[PDB]
Structures are given as structure tokens and as C-alpha cells.
């Protein structure tokens, strides 16, 4: 399909494991907002877009009930064929050119995720980092797998080398993708 | 490693030349497999796999469902374009342009939006092409892109290299210089 722009106004995701669901809108491949199904709240990962319209979170809850219902039907019609675990692909790169003493952001891209269940954490000098970490939702792909991106704001220096740690059922053991200045 | 079963319902809006041309497609997906599709260019549900046949058959028989799907293009795609997408399409973030030697020169063009970008390398006002390699566009996930365009070179004293960048957020091209030191 040839178009100038593409929106997903309803990426609706629901899986048996949990069970668990996700509702997001995407425009030209970036996330506009998600719905926190727990809190019943529309949330914008980049609050700038909250100026571009509102969304009633109830619409997502409604689609999630349909999803639950349709998934059970489809499990039967597909002879209970379970999801094949894919091997995720991990890349770590920085947001801008890296200068020591100049605050930057590391970016961990976890691509080819299926099913959408993953643990992504950061390690500085082999130790788990907590602060300065954030994360996208599971973003959709035209082959119906997902990617997820995690961020680490960091001050580059000689003292710190970092890893991105990724856990997924398609991996035998945790995958560590290393990055250093 | 737990079993899992995944359901995805995607509502997609494709836009060309403003809203002169609008196409909507919905996809019902079991695990990675699209089983039934509505495509506004087609006008009815279409089974994509055998498991989608009774689904498409039923919905095509129900005028309420069929008319709901057919109305989607105006009630969802065009509606959302006026409420949100027209606004999002006005977003412009200028690229940062940075030259760094890796003999290879790396021109980093970072933090720009939208994705349309032109980058050229010059040596002494003569354009280089034979020794140039670029990455694909890189999605940061935070509504910015970056791209790297490398130049194979052999620096003589006196040579001037320039990275030349055009982008819709720029009235005139950014040029950055690198001199053999």
C-alpha cells in the first residue's frame, strides 16, 4: 500500500499469558499515546501530543474485551497452535555524538520481539541501573512482531561502561549488548 | 518457557495528498497470522487464511458490521486527521550536524523530524560519491531520527571537507567543515 502517511488508530494487543493487553495509537511509526489499562487512563509518553486531542480510555477497555473474546475463539479455530518464540535483535547506540562531560542518552533497540513479553534493563559497570531509564510501548511492525526501545540518560566518562540486558523466551540466557565510549 | 497465544487487531489509516485520498484497513491477526482483512478499497471483509472464511462470510452478511467498517474511513481516518494528524504534521525539528573522524569521516545528522533528509559530502567544493556510504534512516523512538553518512578519504594538508544537509525544517542548507589538521 502506497501512502504519504500511515496511522494506527488501534493497535490492539491481547495475549493469553497473564493475561495481558496493550492499546496504543501510532502515527508514521511513532507512539502518540497508550492507555494504562490498569489505571483506566490515557497516557502520553511525550506529553507534547496531549495538545493534539484527547482519548476516552473506555474505548480501549471495550476493544480489550473484544480481543479477549476473539482470542479464545481463534485459539480453537487454530487447533491451539501456540506462539512461536522469535529471537530478538538488540542494538545499542547513542542519541547524539558522544563528548565526555556532555550529557547524552543511550538507546537500546530490541527488535523482532515475539511474543511481546520482554525484560530490558541497564547495567553500568556490571551493576543494575535504576535512574534515568525509560521505555516505549511495544511498537508494531508490518510482520506483526514488535520492537521496544529503552533509554538511559547518562554522563559519558572513562569511569563507566554500560550494557543493555535483555531477557526473552527466544533467548537461551540473557543477552547483554555492550556499549562504551 | 510458557505457552502463549497472541491476538492483534490493527486499524490502519493510509493518507495521500492531504486527505484527497484516504484508505483504511483493519487486520485481525492470530499470533503472526492475519486471518481476516477489511480494506476500504475492497469494500467487504476478505478471508486471508482458511480460518478467516466463516468470519468474513458472516460479517459480510450483517449490514450493521459492513456499514460500520465502510464508515471507518470518515469516522476514524478523516476525523483523526483533522483532530490530530494535521497538527502532528506541522512538527519540525532541525537536524544537528557533526563531523567526526573514525581514514574515514563520519557526518552525524541527529535529532531531526520529519524523516526527509538530504546529505551530501564535498571535497574542495567538488562532490564526493565513490567513497560515501550511509546508514538507513534510524528511528530513535522519541519522534526524532538520525542518519550517519561516512566518507572514505585520504587527507592532504589544505583540503577542506564539507557535509551538506537539507531538510524541510531548514530555509537554507546546513554546511559543516572539517579541515586536515
Amino acid at each position, epitope marked *: 500500500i502506497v501512502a504519504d502517511h500511515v496511522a494506527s488508530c488501534g493497535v490492539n494487543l491481547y495475549q493469553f499469558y497473564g493475561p495481558s493487553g496493550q492499546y496504543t495509537h501510532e502515527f508514521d511509526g511513532d507512539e502518540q499515546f497508550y492507555v494504562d489499562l490498569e489505571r483506566k487512563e490515557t497516557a502520553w509518553r511525550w506529553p507534547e501530543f496531549s495538545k493534539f486531542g484527547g*482519548f*476516552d*480510555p*473506555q*474505548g480501549a*477497555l*471495550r476493544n*480489550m*474485551a*473484544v*480481543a*479477549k*473474546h*476473539n482470542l*479464545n475463539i481463534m485459539i480453537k479455530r487454530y487447533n491451539s497452535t501456540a506462539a512461536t518464540n522469535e529471537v530478538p535483535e538488540v542494538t545499542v547506540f547513542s542519541k547524539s555524538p558522544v563528548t565526555l562531560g556532555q550529557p547524552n542518552t543511550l538507546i537500546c533497540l530490541v527488535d523482532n520481539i515475539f511474543p511481546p513479553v520482554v525484560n530490558i534493563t541497564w547495567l553500568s559497570n556490571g551493576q543494575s541501573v535504576t535512574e534515568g531509564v525509560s521505555e516505549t510501548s511495544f511498537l508494531s511492525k508490518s510482520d506483526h512482531s514488535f520492537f521496544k526501545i529503552s533509554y538511559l540518560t547518562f554522563l559519558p566518562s572513562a569511569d563507566e561502561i554500560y550494557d543493555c540486558k535483555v531477557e526473552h523466551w527466544g533467548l537461551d540466557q540473557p543477552l547483554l549488548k555492550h556499549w562504551e565510549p | 518457557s510458557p505457552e502463549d497465544f497472541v491476538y492483534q487487531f490493527k486499524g490502519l489509516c493510509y493518507f495521500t495528498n492531504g486527505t484527497e485520498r484516504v484508505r483504511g484497513v483493519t487486520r485481525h491477526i492470530y499470533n503472526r497470522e492475519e486471518y481476516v482483512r477489511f480494506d476500504s478499497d475492497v469494500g467487504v471483509y476478505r478471508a486471508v487464511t482458511p480460518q478467516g472464511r466463516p468470519v468474513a462470510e458472516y460479517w459480510n452478511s*450483517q449490514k*450493521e*458490521v459492513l456499514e*460500520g467498517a465502510r464508515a471507518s474511513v470518515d469516522r476514524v481516518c478523516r476525523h483523526n486527521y483533522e483532530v490530530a494528524y494535521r497538527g502532528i504534521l506541522q512538527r519540525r525539528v532541525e537536524p544537528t550536524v557533526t563531523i567526526s573522524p573514525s581514514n574515514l569521516l563520519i557526518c552525524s545528522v541527529t535529532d531531526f523530524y520529519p524523516s526527509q533528509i538530504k546529505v551530501r559530502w564535498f571535497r574542495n567544493d567538488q562532490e564526493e560519491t565513490a567513497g560515501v556510504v550511509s546508514t538507513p534512516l534510524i528511528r530513535n523512538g522519541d519522534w526524532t531520527f538520525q542518519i550517519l553518512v561516512m566518507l572514505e578519504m585520504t587527507p592532504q594538508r589544505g583540503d577542506v571537507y564539507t557535509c551538506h544537509v537539507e531538510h524541510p525544517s531548514l530555509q537554507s542548507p546546513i554546511t559543516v567543515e572539517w579541515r586536515a589538521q
Partner: T-cell receptor
Framework: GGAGVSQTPSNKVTEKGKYVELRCDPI?????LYWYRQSLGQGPEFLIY????????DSGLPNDRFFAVRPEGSVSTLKIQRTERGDSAVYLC??????????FGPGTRLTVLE | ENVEQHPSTLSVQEGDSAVIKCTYS??????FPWYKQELGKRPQLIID?????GEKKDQRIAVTLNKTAKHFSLHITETQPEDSAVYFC???????????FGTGTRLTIIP
């Protein structure tokens, strides 16, 4: 289901502390099913909304003695545990082809006595 | 989010018009059905109107909608005795399909 929304019986009388089940039979093929509650001289108030077998919205359930099911995306049953006098009202079932346009059944009046 | 309905009771001579007015609180409301309820029975859907339309008529009954004022009304012309019932207005929105009802109007047609 049938051509209209059915609820039987029209009336149920019971005493405090007993268990009660109210049954709704939807219009054939209707994906959406709602329970509303109507007290004397008032309008219907929302209790719970099913899409197929799934609960879309249960925000109206008064407390945890109230629970409903729709195990096969057709017939729904509203269950009330340990009934109190304040639960007395007319319980109305409504179903919708897709969700928006709602057709009501004739209701079941629950009378909980001392 | 509530719907406000007036009057709570109304008597009108057979053959005269009957008018019921409602106001709603949520500007996102886009669907507005009206129900007629006979004693011992179910609210019966008699007419509805959507936010893209200001008026709709069906036989003896009419509904009007003013999105700006968030007012909507039901008119019953040349009332007949079988119009005696309790009438409810209601409202819902694109994202929230649950109906919220007014408090009702007991209409008595004097034969």
C-alpha cells in the same frame, strides 16, 4: 437468543441473606449485553457491559456481592449474594448489535423482604 | 456525567402537543436515544438522534438537538391516549457506549 430480549421471571420475591440469579436472553447475534438497574420513579442506571464473553466495563456494580457472567457470549446471568433490602429494584437487560443502539428486555423486579 | 430531564410529570389533553427537554454534561456525547416505558414493562426505544443532525421526525414524534447548548428535546404531536407512559432521554459517546439516562417524565394523556 430470539427476536426480542427476554427476561423471566417478571418478578422475584426473596428475603434478606439469600442468593439470587437473574437471567437474560439476548436478541440473536447481538454482541453487546448490558445490565441496568431501575429504582422506583427513576431512570435506569448502568451496572455492567459485556462485549461477547468479555466484560467491557463493570464500573457500575454496586459492590462485591454483585457479579455477572456471559459464558458463551449470548445468555447472561447476574448473581447477587446475600441479598439486602436495598437491592430491591427492577433489573433490566439490554442488548445491542455492536454496542451503541440498545434494546431493553421487559425487566425482572427483585423484591427483597425482611 | 449526568443527564437532566424536565418535567418529572406532565398532563396534556388528548390532541395537544407534549414536549420534554433534556440537558447533558459531556460535550463528547454523540448519540441520544429516547425510551418509552409502560407500567410493568421495558423501556422501548422509540427514536434517536446523533450529533451530526439537528432534527429528526418520525410520524407523531420529533427530536431536536443543540450540541452547543447541550440541549435536546422530544416533541409528541397530537397526543393519543396510548402515549401515556414514562419517557426517558439518554446519552452516550464514541468511546463510551454505556447510556446515561435522565430521571424520567411521567406523561399522562387526558382522554
Amino acid at each position: 437468543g430470539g427476536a426480542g430480549v427476554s427476561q423471566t421471571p417478571s418478578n422475584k420475591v426473596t428475603e434478606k441473606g439469600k442468593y439470587v440469579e437473574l437471567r437474560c436472553d439476548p436478541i440473536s447475534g447481538h454482541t453487546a449485553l448490558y445490565w441496568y438497574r431501575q429504582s422506583l420513579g427513576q431512570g435506569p442506571e448502568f451496572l455492567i457491559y459485556f462485549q461477547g464473553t468479555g466484560a467491557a466495563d463493570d464500573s457500575g456494580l454496586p459492590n462485591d456481592r454483585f457479579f455477572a457472567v456471559r459464558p458463551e457470549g449470548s445468555v447472561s446471568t447476574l448473581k447477587i449474594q446475600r441479598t439486602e433490602r436495598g437491592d430491591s429494584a427492577v433489573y433490566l437487560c439490554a442488548t445491542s448489535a455492536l454496542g451503541d443502539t440498545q434494546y431493553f428486555g421487559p425487566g425482572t423486579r427483585l423484591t427483597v423482604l425482611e | 456525567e449526568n443527564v437532566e430531564q424536565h418535567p418529572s410529570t406532565l398532563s396534556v389533553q388528548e390532541g395537544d402537543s407534549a414536549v420534554i427537554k433534556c440537558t447533558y454534561s459531556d460535550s463528547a456525547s454523540n448519540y441520544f436515544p429516547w425510551y418509552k416505558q409502560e407500567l410493568g414493562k421495558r423501556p422501548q426505544l422509540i427514536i434517536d438522534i446523533r450529533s451530526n443532525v439537528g432534527e429528526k421526525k418520525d410520524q407523531r414524534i420529533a427530536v431536536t438537538l443543540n450540541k452547543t447548548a447541550k440541549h435536546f428535546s422530544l416533541h409528541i404531536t397530537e397526543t393519543q391516549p396510548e402515549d401515556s407512559a414514562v419517557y426517558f432521554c439518554a446519552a452516550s459517546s464514541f468511546g463510551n457506549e454505556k447510556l446515561t439516562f435522565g430521571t424520567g417524565t411521567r406523561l399522562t394523556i387526558i382522554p
